[PDB]
Enzyme design. Structure first.
Site, mmCIF file in Angstrom:
data_model
loop_
_atom_site.group_PDB
_atom_site.id
_atom_site.type_symbol
_atom_site.label_atom_id
_atom_site.label_comp_id
_atom_site.label_asym_id
_atom_site.label_seq_id
_atom_site.Cartn_x
_atom_site.Cartn_y
_atom_site.Cartn_z
ATOM 1 C CG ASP A 25 1.028 -0.409 6.016
ATOM 2 O OD1 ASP A 25 0.443 0.478 5.024
ATOM 3 O OD2 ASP A 25 1.200 -1.431 5.810
ATOM 4 C CB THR A 26 0.078 5.779 5.293
ATOM 5 O OG1 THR A 26 0.087 5.218 3.666
ATOM 6 C CG2 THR A 26 1.197 6.739 5.560
ATOM 7 N N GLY A 27 -1.358 2.558 4.963
ATOM 8 C CA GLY A 27 -2.678 1.870 4.845
ATOM 9 C C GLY A 27 -3.168 0.851 5.858
HETATM 10 C C1 2AH Z 1 -8.892 -2.082 7.932
HETATM 11 O O1 2AH Z 1 -7.941 -2.917 7.517
HETATM 12 C C2 2AH Z 1 -6.610 -2.551 7.619
HETATM 13 O O2 2AH Z 1 -6.247 -1.387 7.888
HETATM 14 N N1 2AH Z 1 -5.704 -3.827 7.387
HETATM 15 C C3 2AH Z 1 -4.031 -3.374 7.603
HETATM 16 C C4 2AH Z 1 -3.578 -3.999 6.137
HETATM 17 O O3 2AH Z 1 -3.639 -5.187 5.884
HETATM 18 N N2 2AH Z 1 -3.132 -2.908 5.223
HETATM 19 N N3 2AH Z 1 -3.124 -2.894 3.980
HETATM 20 C C5 2AH Z 1 -4.115 -2.470 2.665
HETATM 21 C C6 2AH Z 1 -5.593 -3.014 3.311
HETATM 22 C C7 2AH Z 1 -6.265 -2.269 3.706
HETATM 23 C C8 2AH Z 1 -7.809 -2.812 4.100
HETATM 24 C C9 2AH Z 1 -7.996 -4.157 3.925
HETATM 25 C C10 2AH Z 1 -9.359 -4.509 4.485
HETATM 26 C C11 2AH Z 1 -9.416 -5.954 4.434
HETATM 27 C C12 2AH Z 1 -10.798 -6.606 4.707
HETATM 28 C C13 2AH Z 1 -11.782 -5.684 5.154
HETATM 29 C C14 2AH Z 1 -11.626 -4.186 5.364
HETATM 30 N N4 2AH Z 1 -10.241 -3.706 4.746
HETATM 31 C C15 2AH Z 1 -6.993 -4.992 3.489
HETATM 32 C C16 2AH Z 1 -5.618 -4.467 3.014
HETATM 33 C C17 2AH Z 1 -1.949 -3.524 3.349
HETATM 34 C C18 2AH Z 1 -0.461 -3.741 3.488
HETATM 35 O O4 2AH Z 1 0.280 -2.554 3.622
HETATM 36 C C19 2AH Z 1 -0.230 -4.423 4.968
HETATM 37 C C20 2AH Z 1 1.136 -5.272 4.934
HETATM 38 C C21 2AH Z 1 2.289 -4.730 4.789
HETATM 39 C C22 2AH Z 1 3.456 -5.508 4.803
HETATM 40 C C23 2AH Z 1 3.497 -6.841 5.173
HETATM 41 C C24 2AH Z 1 1.925 -7.564 4.854
HETATM 42 C C25 2AH Z 1 1.040 -6.676 4.807
HETATM 43 C C26 2AH Z 1 -0.169 -4.677 2.256
HETATM 44 O O5 2AH Z 1 -1.195 -5.359 2.174
HETATM 45 N N5 2AH Z 1 1.078 -4.402 1.543
HETATM 46 C C27 2AH Z 1 1.035 -5.449 0.299
HETATM 47 C C28 2AH Z 1 0.540 -5.026 -0.900
HETATM 48 C C29 2AH Z 1 -0.443 -4.162 -1.297
HETATM 49 C C30 2AH Z 1 -0.830 -4.081 -2.539
HETATM 50 C C31 2AH Z 1 -0.107 -4.336 -3.575
HETATM 51 C C32 2AH Z 1 1.233 -4.963 -3.344
HETATM 52 C C33 2AH Z 1 1.267 -5.314 -1.826
HETATM 53 C C34 2AH Z 1 2.605 -6.009 -1.574
HETATM 54 C C35 2AH Z 1 2.762 -5.696 0.276
HETATM 55 O O6 2AH Z 1 3.341 -4.415 0.122
HETATM 56 C C36 2AH Z 1 -3.642 -4.151 8.985
HETATM 57 C C37 2AH Z 1 -4.046 -5.822 8.741
HETATM 58 C C38 2AH Z 1 -2.181 -4.170 8.987
HETATM 59 C C39 2AH Z 1 -4.063 -3.700 10.000
#
Ligand code: 2AH
Lengths: 99, 99
Positions: A25-27
């Site tokens: 997960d790059t995000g």
């Molecule tokens: C810095 O925070 C992070 O890096 N958070 C990470 C995070 O949640 N990352 N990102 C985006 C994302 C990015 C930032 C924030 C965020 C929220 C509050 C404050 C600051 N940033 C939320 C979501 C989203 C993540 O890929 C993580 C994930 C992957 C698999 C299952 C559940 C969740 C995700 O949410 N994927 C889902 C998604 C996103 C958009 C559209 C559809 C879908 C369906 C899913 O594919 C974490 C918790 C793994 C480490």
């Protein structure tokens, strides 16, 4: 290897003597795995995603192997719906986005 | 280009004639952007992330440019913490993971 994104980029990881499937997960800033036991000290942490925050345990300097590539880093453990390999470990195995 | 992951893979995108910063997220199945206005009718959708699910508005066949790469596809709009470019659009621009 080159991984396409037609499907979720899931790979096998080896951690704590266990084999698990995880999402590259790059995000994701951090790496977070479903409830499991890990050695050493830990500190609580709140991490946020879509939908809000969840509380996890933070373990530092944890050895992990992703697709045959060994690495060390912080690993979070908590109620995540899927095992996620974040940037902190992706950098170590030399993973990059290309297009 | 080749993007490393030492920092968040944030890029500039253009939608509705406006520039925005978004996260290239391989762990995201879909593309979701912070509240904004888009043309046409929308459909309902629930997307799940780390802390739960959120309701979003789904718009189809939307023109969107990512790093200068023109794409046309589904864009979700809702209460997301950050703009996320998911696999539906990463595949359109030919993005892959490599290591
Ligand atoms: C810095 O925070 C992070 O890096 N958070 C990470 C995070 O949640 N990352 N990102 C985006 C994302 C990015 C930032 C924030 C965020 C929220 C509050 C404050 C600051 N940033 C939320 C979501 C989203 C993540 O890929 C993580 C994930 C992957 C698999 C299952 C559940 C969740 C995700 O949410 N994927 C889902 C998604 C996103 C958009 C559209 C559809 C879908 C369906 C899913 O594919 C974490 C918790 C793994 C480490």
């Amino acid at each position: 290897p080159q991984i396409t994104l037609w499907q979720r980029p899931l790979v096998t990881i080896k951690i704590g003597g266990q084999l698990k499937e995880a999402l590259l997960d790059t995000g994701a800033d951090d790496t977070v795995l479903e409830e499991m036991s890990l050695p050493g000290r830990w500190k609580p942490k709140m991490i946020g995603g879509i939908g809000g925050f969840i509380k996890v345990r933070q373990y530092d300097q944890i050895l992990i192997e992703i697709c045959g590539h060994k690495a060390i880093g912080t690993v979070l453990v908590g109620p995540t719906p899927v095992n996620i390999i974040g940037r902190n470990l992706l950098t170590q195995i030399g993973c990059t986005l290309n297009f």
